[PDB]
Write a protein that binds this ligand. Structure first.
Ligand SMILES: [Cl-]
Ligand SMILES: [Cl-]
Ligand SMILES: [Cl-]
Ligand SMILES: [Cl-]
Ligand SMILES: [Cl-]
Ligand SMILES: [Cl-]
Ligand SMILES: [Cl-]
Length: 183
């Protein structure tokens, strides 16, 4: 029984302990493992969007499935427990949310735009942040002015136009901020 025949798996933003567990179980399941992001990679297991590997997959590898860290351990346990593994291999259930680990704040944006943006952020696995804090990942700004904008620059927080959100959603992955800079 080799369920994951044809699968080539790579990890990013995963701790060594879980990474070893993943590589071990994935190999048992019949998959190939890669330390480097090579061409034959089919599945990227990610714990963050803010890595060279994730960014590469986002801009150049639309064919690659971005997976959550819990995919392999769950699939492996189901295998061992004698459960019948259906065609799909729990991939769809364990696809990483598009805005995983994104913490989105807004400025210079009115209603009902503000309400609609929050709607799509929550729907796609992100966190909405009414006030700006240092752990905010993206500030969506209508204009380049005001207290939030200035603190965003000072703290080196991504400042993007709303198109960042729409195209990240379309792509099913977080896109890099410079493509959506304010003019
Ligand atoms: Cl890693
Ligand atoms: Cl490798
Ligand atoms: Cl690499
Ligand atoms: Cl999603
Ligand atoms: Cl906000
Ligand atoms: Cl757009
Ligand atoms: Cl796209």
């Amino acid at each position: 029984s080799k369920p994951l025949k044809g699968f080539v798996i790579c990890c990013t933003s995963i701790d060594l302990k879980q990474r070893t567990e993943i590589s071990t179980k994935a190999t048992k399941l019949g998959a190939a493992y890669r330390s480097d992001f090579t061409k034959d990679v089919t599945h990227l297991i990610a714990g963050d969007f803010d890595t060279p590997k994730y960014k590469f997959a986002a801009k150049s590898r639309p064919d690659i499935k971005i997976m959550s860290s819990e995919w392999i351990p769950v699939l492996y346990e189901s295998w061992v427990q004698g459960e019948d593994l259906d065609d799909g291999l729990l991939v769809d259930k364990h696809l990483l949310p598009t805005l995983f680990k994104c913490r989105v704040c807004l400025t210079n944006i009115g209603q009902p735009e503000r309400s609609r943006i929050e709607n799509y952020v929550l729907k796609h696995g992100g966190t909405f942040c009414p006030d700006l804090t240092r752990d905010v990942t993206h500030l969506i700004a209508g204009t380049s002015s005001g207290r939030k904008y200035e603190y965003a620059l000072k703290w080196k927080i991504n400042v993007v136009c709303v198109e960042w959100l729409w195209q990240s959603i379309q792509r099913n992955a977080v896109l890099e901020p410079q493509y959506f800079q304010l003019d």
